[PDB]
Enzyme design. Structure first.
Site, PDB file in Angstrom:
ATOM      1  N   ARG A 183     -21.288  20.398   2.380  1.00 52.10           N
ATOM      2  CA  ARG A 183     -22.561  20.758   3.006  1.00 52.10           C
ATOM      3  C   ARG A 183     -23.694  20.969   1.996  1.00 52.10           C
TER       4      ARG A 183
ATOM      5  N   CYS B 171       1.882  29.223   8.138  1.00 48.81           N
ATOM      6  CA  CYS B 171       2.394  28.833   6.816  1.00 48.81           C
ATOM      7  C   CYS B 171       3.616  27.917   6.871  1.00 48.81           C
TER       8      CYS B 171
ATOM      9  N   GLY C 210     -14.033  23.906   1.371  1.00 48.03           N
ATOM     10  CA  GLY C 210     -13.049  24.929   0.991  1.00 48.03           C
ATOM     11  C   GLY C 210     -11.774  24.337   0.417  1.00 48.03           C
ATOM     12  N   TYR C 211     -10.773  25.190   0.200  1.00 50.54           N
ATOM     13  CA  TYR C 211      -9.517  24.770  -0.443  1.00 50.54           C
ATOM     14  C   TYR C 211      -8.709  23.771   0.397  1.00 50.54           C
TER      15      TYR C 211
ATOM     16  N   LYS D  52       2.084  21.173   3.678  1.00 54.53           N
ATOM     17  CA  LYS D  52       1.065  20.755   2.706  1.00 54.53           C
ATOM     18  C   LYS D  52       1.676  20.510   1.327  1.00 54.53           C
TER      19      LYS D  52
ATOM     20  N   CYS E  55       1.152  26.114   4.340  1.00 48.37           N
ATOM     21  CA  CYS E  55       1.663  26.071   2.961  1.00 48.37           C
ATOM     22  C   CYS E  55       2.825  25.101   2.779  1.00 48.37           C
TER      23      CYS E  55
ATOM     24  N   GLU F   5      -7.629  19.983  -0.835  1.00 45.66           N
ATOM     25  CA  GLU F   5      -6.192  19.679  -0.820  1.00 45.66           C
ATOM     26  C   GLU F   5      -5.882  18.413  -0.012  1.00 45.66           C
TER      27      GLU F   5
ATOM     28  N   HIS G 183       4.751  25.857 -27.579  1.00 43.02           N
ATOM     29  CA  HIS G 183       4.303  24.500 -27.886  1.00 43.02           C
ATOM     30  C   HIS G 183       5.494  23.542 -27.710  1.00 43.02           C
TER      31      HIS G 183
ATOM     32  N   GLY H 127     -13.785  26.130   7.536  1.00 45.36           N
ATOM     33  CA  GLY H 127     -13.162  27.437   7.334  1.00 45.36           C
ATOM     34  C   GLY H 127     -12.193  27.797   8.445  1.00 45.36           C
TER      35      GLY H 127
ATOM     36  N   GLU I  90      -0.176  27.322 -23.364  1.00 43.31           N
ATOM     37  CA  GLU I  90      -0.525  27.897 -24.678  1.00 43.31           C
ATOM     38  C   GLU I  90      -2.029  27.980 -24.971  1.00 43.31           C
TER      39      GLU I  90
HETATM   40  C1  LIG Z   1      13.604  17.278 -33.028  1.00 35.75           C
HETATM   41  C2  LIG Z   1      12.775  18.527 -33.168  1.00 35.75           C
HETATM   42  C3  LIG Z   1      12.116  19.067 -32.065  1.00 35.75           C
HETATM   43  C4  LIG Z   1      11.347  20.225 -32.195  1.00 35.75           C
HETATM   44  N1  LIG Z   1      10.727  20.716 -31.096  1.00 35.75           N
HETATM   45  C5  LIG Z   1       9.966  21.834 -31.147  1.00 35.75           C
HETATM   46  C6  LIG Z   1       9.270  22.388 -29.948  1.00 35.75           C
HETATM   47  O1  LIG Z   1       9.366  21.831 -28.834  1.00 35.75           O
HETATM   48  N2  LIG Z   1       8.531  23.502 -30.081  1.00 35.75           N
HETATM   49  C7  LIG Z   1       8.403  24.131 -31.268  1.00 35.75           C
HETATM   50  O2  LIG Z   1       7.702  25.161 -31.333  1.00 35.75           O
HETATM   51  N3  LIG Z   1       9.004  23.685 -32.404  1.00 35.75           N
HETATM   52  C8  LIG Z   1       9.783  22.571 -32.425  1.00 35.75           C
HETATM   53  N4  LIG Z   1      10.410  22.096 -33.605  1.00 35.75           N
HETATM   54  C9  LIG Z   1      10.222  22.871 -34.845  1.00 35.75           C
HETATM   55  C10 LIG Z   1       8.885  22.607 -35.513  1.00 35.75           C
HETATM   56  O3  LIG Z   1       8.689  21.199 -35.656  1.00 35.75           O
HETATM   57  C11 LIG Z   1       8.849  23.275 -36.885  1.00 35.75           C
HETATM   58  O4  LIG Z   1       9.227  24.654 -36.772  1.00 35.75           O
HETATM   59  C12 LIG Z   1       7.472  23.212 -37.527  1.00 35.75           C
HETATM   60  O5  LIG Z   1       7.038  21.852 -37.679  1.00 35.75           O
HETATM   61  C13 LIG Z   1       7.524  23.906 -38.881  1.00 35.75           C
HETATM   62  O6  LIG Z   1       6.290  23.731 -39.559  1.00 35.75           O
HETATM   63  P1  LIG Z   1       6.256  23.918 -41.147  1.00 35.75           P
HETATM   64  O7  LIG Z   1       4.813  23.835 -41.576  1.00 35.75           O
HETATM   65  O8  LIG Z   1       7.069  25.145 -41.475  1.00 35.75           O
HETATM   66  O9  LIG Z   1       7.078  22.651 -41.716  1.00 35.75           O
HETATM   67  P2  LIG Z   1       6.818  21.106 -41.317  1.00 35.75           P
HETATM   68  O10 LIG Z   1       5.880  20.957 -40.143  1.00 35.75           O
HETATM   69  O11 LIG Z   1       8.159  20.418 -41.285  1.00 35.75           O
HETATM   70  O12 LIG Z   1       6.009  20.564 -42.585  1.00 35.75           O
HETATM   71  C14 LIG Z   1       6.566  20.524 -43.891  1.00 35.75           C
HETATM   72  C15 LIG Z   1       5.849  19.416 -44.644  1.00 35.75           C
HETATM   73  O13 LIG Z   1       5.909  19.653 -46.048  1.00 35.75           O
HETATM   74  C16 LIG Z   1       6.139  18.411 -46.712  1.00 35.75           C
HETATM   75  N5  LIG Z   1       6.751  18.682 -48.036  1.00 35.75           N
HETATM   76  C17 LIG Z   1       7.989  19.146 -48.291  1.00 35.75           C
HETATM   77  N6  LIG Z   1       8.183  19.291 -49.628  1.00 35.75           N
HETATM   78  C18 LIG Z   1       7.047  18.923 -50.244  1.00 35.75           C
HETATM   79  C19 LIG Z   1       6.563  18.830 -51.644  1.00 35.75           C
HETATM   80  N7  LIG Z   1       7.365  19.174 -52.682  1.00 35.75           N
HETATM   81  N8  LIG Z   1       5.293  18.390 -51.841  1.00 35.75           N
HETATM   82  C20 LIG Z   1       4.474  18.046 -50.817  1.00 35.75           C
HETATM   83  N9  LIG Z   1       4.857  18.106 -49.525  1.00 35.75           N
HETATM   84  C21 LIG Z   1       6.103  18.529 -49.186  1.00 35.75           C
HETATM   85  C22 LIG Z   1       6.980  17.592 -45.747  1.00 35.75           C
HETATM   86  O14 LIG Z   1       6.807  16.187 -45.950  1.00 35.75           O
HETATM   87  C23 LIG Z   1       6.451  18.037 -44.398  1.00 35.75           C
HETATM   88  O15 LIG Z   1       5.429  17.159 -43.928  1.00 35.75           O
HETATM   89  C24 LIG Z   1      11.213  20.913 -33.527  1.00 35.75           C
HETATM   90  C25 LIG Z   1      11.886  20.353 -34.628  1.00 35.75           C
HETATM   91  C26 LIG Z   1      12.653  19.193 -34.493  1.00 35.75           C
HETATM   92  C27 LIG Z   1      13.354  18.626 -35.701  1.00 35.75           C
HETATM   93  C1  LIG Z   2      -3.543  23.779   5.969  1.00 36.92           C
HETATM   94  C2  LIG Z   2      -3.305  25.183   5.474  1.00 36.92           C
HETATM   95  C3  LIG Z   2      -2.722  25.385   4.226  1.00 36.92           C
HETATM   96  C4  LIG Z   2      -2.491  26.672   3.747  1.00 36.92           C
HETATM   97  N1  LIG Z   2      -1.922  26.812   2.522  1.00 36.92           N
HETATM   98  C5  LIG Z   2      -1.674  28.030   1.997  1.00 36.92           C
HETATM   99  C6  LIG Z   2      -1.051  28.213   0.656  1.00 36.92           C
HETATM  100  O1  LIG Z   2      -0.732  27.235  -0.056  1.00 36.92           O
HETATM  101  N2  LIG Z   2      -0.834  29.462   0.213  1.00 36.92           N
HETATM  102  C7  LIG Z   2      -1.168  30.544   0.947  1.00 36.92           C
HETATM  103  O2  LIG Z   2      -0.949  31.686   0.495  1.00 36.92           O
HETATM  104  N3  LIG Z   2      -1.738  30.457   2.176  1.00 36.92           N
HETATM  105  C8  LIG Z   2      -2.018  29.264   2.754  1.00 36.92           C
HETATM  106  N4  LIG Z   2      -2.608  29.171   4.040  1.00 36.92           N
HETATM  107  C9  LIG Z   2      -2.940  30.425   4.744  1.00 36.92           C
HETATM  108  C10 LIG Z   2      -1.720  31.055   5.405  1.00 36.92           C
HETATM  109  O3  LIG Z   2      -1.085  30.100   6.263  1.00 36.92           O
HETATM  110  C11 LIG Z   2      -2.122  32.296   6.202  1.00 36.92           C
HETATM  111  O4  LIG Z   2      -2.837  33.210   5.354  1.00 36.92           O
HETATM  112  C12 LIG Z   2      -0.913  33.007   6.804  1.00 36.92           C
HETATM  113  O5  LIG Z   2      -0.208  32.132   7.693  1.00 36.92           O
HETATM  114  C13 LIG Z   2      -1.358  34.251   7.559  1.00 36.92           C
HETATM  115  O6  LIG Z   2      -0.257  34.828   8.244  1.00 36.92           O
HETATM  116  P1  LIG Z   2      -0.534  35.735   9.539  1.00 36.92           P
HETATM  117  O7  LIG Z   2       0.776  36.362   9.952  1.00 36.92           O
HETATM  118  O8  LIG Z   2      -1.729  36.602   9.240  1.00 36.92           O
HETATM  119  O9  LIG Z   2      -0.992  34.647  10.639  1.00 36.92           O
HETATM  120  P2  LIG Z   2      -0.106  33.377  11.100  1.00 36.92           P
HETATM  121  O10 LIG Z   2       0.968  33.028  10.097  1.00 36.92           O
HETATM  122  O11 LIG Z   2      -1.073  32.293  11.497  1.00 36.92           O
HETATM  123  O12 LIG Z   2       0.657  33.934  12.404  1.00 36.92           O
HETATM  124  C14 LIG Z   2       0.017  34.207  13.649  1.00 36.92           C
HETATM  125  C15 LIG Z   2       0.974  33.848  14.784  1.00 36.92           C
HETATM  126  O13 LIG Z   2       0.723  34.685  15.915  1.00 36.92           O
HETATM  127  C16 LIG Z   2       0.725  33.905  17.116  1.00 36.92           C
HETATM  128  N5  LIG Z   2      -0.169  34.548  18.113  1.00 36.92           N
HETATM  129  C17 LIG Z   2      -1.518  34.592  18.117  1.00 36.92           C
HETATM  130  N6  LIG Z   2      -1.977  35.298  19.183  1.00 36.92           N
HETATM  131  C18 LIG Z   2      -0.907  35.727  19.877  1.00 36.92           C
HETATM  132  C19 LIG Z   2      -0.667  36.526  21.108  1.00 36.92           C
HETATM  133  N7  LIG Z   2      -1.702  37.018  21.826  1.00 36.92           N
HETATM  134  N8  LIG Z   2       0.620  36.742  21.484  1.00 36.92           N
HETATM  135  C20 LIG Z   2       1.667  36.262  20.774  1.00 36.92           C
HETATM  136  N9  LIG Z   2       1.515  35.527  19.652  1.00 36.92           N
HETATM  137  C21 LIG Z   2       0.280  35.235  19.162  1.00 36.92           C
HETATM  138  C22 LIG Z   2       0.340  32.496  16.698  1.00 36.92           C
HETATM  139  O14 LIG Z   2       0.937  31.522  17.561  1.00 36.92           O
HETATM  140  C23 LIG Z   2       0.845  32.405  15.266  1.00 36.92           C
HETATM  141  O15 LIG Z   2       2.117  31.755  15.193  1.00 36.92           O
HETATM  142  C24 LIG Z   2      -2.865  27.870   4.575  1.00 36.92           C
HETATM  143  C25 LIG Z   2      -3.447  27.651   5.834  1.00 36.92           C
HETATM  144  C26 LIG Z   2      -3.677  26.361   6.309  1.00 36.92           C
HETATM  145  C27 LIG Z   2      -4.306  26.196   7.669  1.00 36.92           C
END
Ligand SMILES: Cc1cc2nc3c(=O)[nH]c(=O)nc-3n(C[C@H](O)[C@H](O)[C@H](O)COP(=O)(O)OP(=O)(O)OC[C@H]3O[C@@H](n4cnc5c(N)ncnc54)[C@H](O)[C@@H]3O)c2cc1C
Ligand SMILES: Cc1cc2nc3c(=O)[nH]c(=O)nc-3n(C[C@H](O)[C@H](O)[C@H](O)COP(=O)(O)OP(=O)(O)OC[C@H]3O[C@@H](n4cnc5c(N)ncnc54)[C@H](O)[C@@H]3O)c2cc1C
Lengths: 448, 448
Positions: free
Chosen positions: A197, A41, A175-176, A49, A46, A180, A437, A260, A442
């Site tokens: 294969r 690893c 395989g994976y 990679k 891991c 990758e 959102h 494998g 989500e």
């Molecule tokens: C800069 C910014 C970033 C934000 N980022 C996020 C975020 O990342 N994640 C998140 O979950 N929330 C975010 N929010 C909050 C989110 O946008 C609001 O909580 C959500 O849009 C509320 O929905 P609503 O239906 O209550 O009101 P709104 O979506 O504001 O809709 C109200 C609508 O009613 C209309 N309206 C008002 N009065 C009248 C009327 N008398 N007649 C007809 N139409 C009318 C308006 O024109 C408006 O279109 C953010 C807000 C801002 C300002």
């Molecule tokens: C390219 C690649 C990518 C991978 N990516 C991931 C990943 O993203 N996430 C994940 O969870 N897993 C990943 N794996 C799998 C992961 O590396 C193994 O599951 C993990 O290393 C297993 O640990 P281990 O202790 O069982 O064996 P190892 O970590 O291989 O350790 C065995 C060690 O024992 C030594 N040894 C062997 N025989 C003897 C002996 N007779 N005397 C003394 N020492 C000995 C070896 O030299 C070796 O260093 C990946 C594997 C590969 C090949």
């Protein structure tokens, strides 16, 4: 003779985890490691990679999205040597942290190849080492299929060894790891071809999600070749030529086997200790990681329950809780383990596929929810990138037994849903939760 | 006299979602809108902000991380006009999509300022529109303080109205919109200063996370000014000068008020219907969104339960289920709503802060788990960006009553945990869930 309460054959994810936690509860521990510390690893898995994946995501942003967000470059040059130097610098610093943890918890690092002499003893460079508890965590190695000229093809180990990126590359496998590496090398500009294969890549993963990956490969002109069984490899002036069973052939600079991984079981003298293998070739163990011989245990990739790093870490840590912190019935739970595949874009999965759920609960008992959409990131540009989510429910109460996704941001969203799904979450539990959102996540709580 | 089963005053998030779901169950419905269809979120809120945030994330990526991942350029050139054009094209298409959903559900779009005549009738451009059910979803407006020269400063509406970015801007406010706009415009190279009235930004967010944001602002040279109470704004030859209570002053091309948002309650002739306001100035409603008058309802920002888009959407959809699908006790759950602030980097939160948890449960019934680290993404580069995660548990069972985060990828990881926390997840449930490696999200399931 050398006395330790417990030893670990292998200093990878499993070995480090088990011995650190054993030493944490006042046991004399020791790790034995052939190659570099940290295992697959840290060194060749891991960590490197994922760093190269991040590099590819930046290359993607530059080439695909930047223009429509108002960014234009002049001389955008990619130096792979710069990425590789900083990739290995991070690995060096991560590897030193593991040495600091050994020394603090009282764990001796023993550089060498361990080999069983008897059920309580191992040989390292001639010198014997004895212990009441021995953990086999030797890991795995890349699978090379038995065909003529197979030695010409490299593996994932050879990809991280590269100091410069080749002109072309031919990836063989479905395989994976295959997906990758194909995604990363293609995005870096290597003439990358992927050959599966049969049928499609990732046959264990859900079809709807994998279909989304295939669509993305078509859209980015990453050539995928289905129904390609390799019969032979051969040397040429261009590089290496692959001969397939259907009739066709293909040539490239490098060829990578990524079919494998198989467990490390052969160089251990397991018959001297008495440790047996199961039918599939892994070390035979029970639910508590015990081998057939008492005082010897196995975990990680060598046992093959689920070949992931945190599976080895928890299995290791759980074993040391059992042996040294009195938790007699403590064991690893292998169900509902989440996975992320860092493809382009990332795939994320936890729980059962649609076909798994049908066999488990019955065909009539499963309902499915799907959602195709484009992320806001890509959808306001030329290059619209499709995302695909899926939820699989079961029973009258609609227990969520599977969650699957492909898209931008999927890699980071699965962990939380994995906690919910393991607790027995229903569709009603999802729908009651208010959306965040604007995000991609989500979509999972607003499906119909 | 036009007649309907139900009508919505306002065509925003709340109004559209209520009428579409009303129309879905066969009720003849109509949406009445003054300005632009989609409301604040689509036209001047969530959508344009998040697109600008993504634009800023690309700028951050090239300047701070690009070099150490192997990317260099002779000249990186940013053009805001290109970003804005594509931003407004995405908003044009999103706004067009509502016309399709209206034709399926049988929803008429009336255009004009609505105004009550009596308890069951409204007036739009002279034409009287009667209805059995009337839903007030008028939303909110930016609050402008009452001080000399306050008119000289704009709001978030004016930021999105900008065709070109100004040379300098002063943001007056401490809420989520102030922090979001300050981060985006700073990243685009605008000379941006943020002025808060008291000790820190984001009162109501957890100190540990806010302290992390303040640290990133100071690291990236985005000036945060504290204890700055504006007494006067003044037009000058330099630009627009702000005079504070402490005797200092500051000048910038633009001044943006981001002090908060207030409900649209004054243009509706609410007295003619008999609809009242509560002491806080929002429309008075019960848990079922019913006003004091029979057959009139209110939801979204105008009632002020939790001012977010998905809150207005769910409350509206739940109301139509109650009226037109025989679910007489169905109502919006306003507790434990997740939130993401798109700062640099993104903040995410669900449940209680540490102060809130101590007030509820007492000091000695609360355990806190913290984790400060650098993401793998930024840790390879010169610019080590800090992530901060926090869990708060309560009782002997260690029920997770709060989760908080700031860092790369936090925006997408919260949704899943929010489902879990809403189900009553404990620390044991978190620790039982296997980590996804290598991600940032795995930190929440491996805290000790
Ligand atoms: C800069 C910014 C970033 C934000 N980022 C996020 C975020 O990342 N994640 C998140 O979950 N929330 C975010 N929010 C909050 C989110 O946008 C609001 O909580 C959500 O849009 C509320 O929905 P609503 O239906 O209550 O009101 P709104 O979506 O504001 O809709 C109200 C609508 O009613 C209309 N309206 C008002 N009065 C009248 C009327 N008398 N007649 C007809 N139409 C009318 C308006 O024109 C408006 O279109 C953010 C807000 C801002 C300002
Ligand atoms: C390219 C690649 C990518 C991978 N990516 C991931 C990943 O993203 N996430 C994940 O969870 N897993 C990943 N794996 C799998 C992961 O590396 C193994 O599951 C993990 O290393 C297993 O640990 P281990 O202790 O069982 O064996 P190892 O970590 O291989 O350790 C065995 C060690 O024992 C030594 N040894 C062997 N025989 C003897 C002996 N007779 N005397 C003394 N020492 C000995 C070896 O030299 C070796 O260093 C990946 C594997 C590969 C090949």
């Amino acid at each position: 003779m050398r006395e330790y309460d417990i030893i670990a054959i292998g200093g990878g994810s499993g070995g480090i985890a088990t011995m650190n936690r054993a030493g944490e509860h006042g046991a004399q521990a020791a790790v034995i490691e052939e190659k570099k510390l940290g295992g697959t690893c840290v060194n060749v898995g891991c960590v490197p990679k994922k760093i190269m994946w991040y590099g590819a995501q930046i290359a993607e942003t530059f080439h695909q999205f930047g223009e429509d967000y108002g960014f234009k470059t002049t001389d955008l040059n990619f130096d792979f040597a710069t990425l590789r130097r900083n990739r290995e610098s991070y690995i060096d610093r991560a590897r030193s942290s593991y040495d600091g943890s050994f020394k603090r918890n009282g764990v001796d690092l023993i550089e060498g190849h361990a080999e069983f002499v008897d059920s309580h003893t191992v040989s390292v460079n001639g010198e014997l080492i004895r212990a009441k508890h021995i953990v086999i965590a030797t890991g795995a190695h890349p699978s090379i299929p038995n065909i003529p000229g197979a030695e010409l093809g490299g593996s994932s180990d050879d990809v991280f060894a590269w100091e410069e990126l080749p002109e072309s590359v031919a990836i063989l496998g479905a395989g994976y790891i295959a997906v990758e590496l194909a995604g990363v090398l293609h995005t870096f500009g290597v003439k990358t071809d992927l050959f599966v294969r049969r049928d499609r890549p990732l046959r264990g993963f859900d079809s709807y999600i994998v279909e989304g990956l295939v669509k993305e490969m078509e859209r980015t002109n990453l050539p995928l070749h289905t129904h390609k069984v390799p019969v032979k490899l051969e040397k040429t002036t261009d590089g290496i030529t692959i001969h397939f069973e259907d009739g066709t052939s293909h040539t490239a600079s490098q060829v990578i086997w990524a079919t494998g991984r198989r467990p490390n079981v052969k160089g251990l003298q397991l018959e001297k200790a008495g440790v047996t293998l199961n039918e599939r070739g892994f070390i035979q163990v029970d639910e508590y990681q015990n081998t057939v011989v008492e005082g010897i245990y196995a975990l990680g990739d060598v046992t093959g329950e689920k070949e992931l790093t945190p599976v080895a870490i928890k299995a290791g840590r759980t074993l040391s809780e059992r042996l040294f912190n009195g938790k007699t019935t403590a064991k690893m739970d292998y169900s509902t383990i989440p996975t992320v595949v860092f493809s382009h874009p990332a795939i994320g999965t936890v729980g059962l596929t649609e076909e798994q759920a049908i066999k488990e609960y019955g065909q009539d008992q499963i309902k499915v929810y799907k959602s195709s959409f484009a992320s806001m990131y890509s959808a306001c540009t030329r290059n619209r990138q499709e995302s695909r989510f899926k939820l699989i429910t079961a029973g009258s109460e609609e227990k969520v037994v599977g969650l699957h996704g492909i898209g931008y941001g999927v890699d980071e969203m699965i962990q939380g849903f994995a906690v919910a799904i393991k607790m027995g979450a229903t569709k009603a539990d999802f729908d009651a939760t208010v959306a965040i959102h604007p995000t991609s996540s989500e979509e999972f709580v607003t499906m119909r």
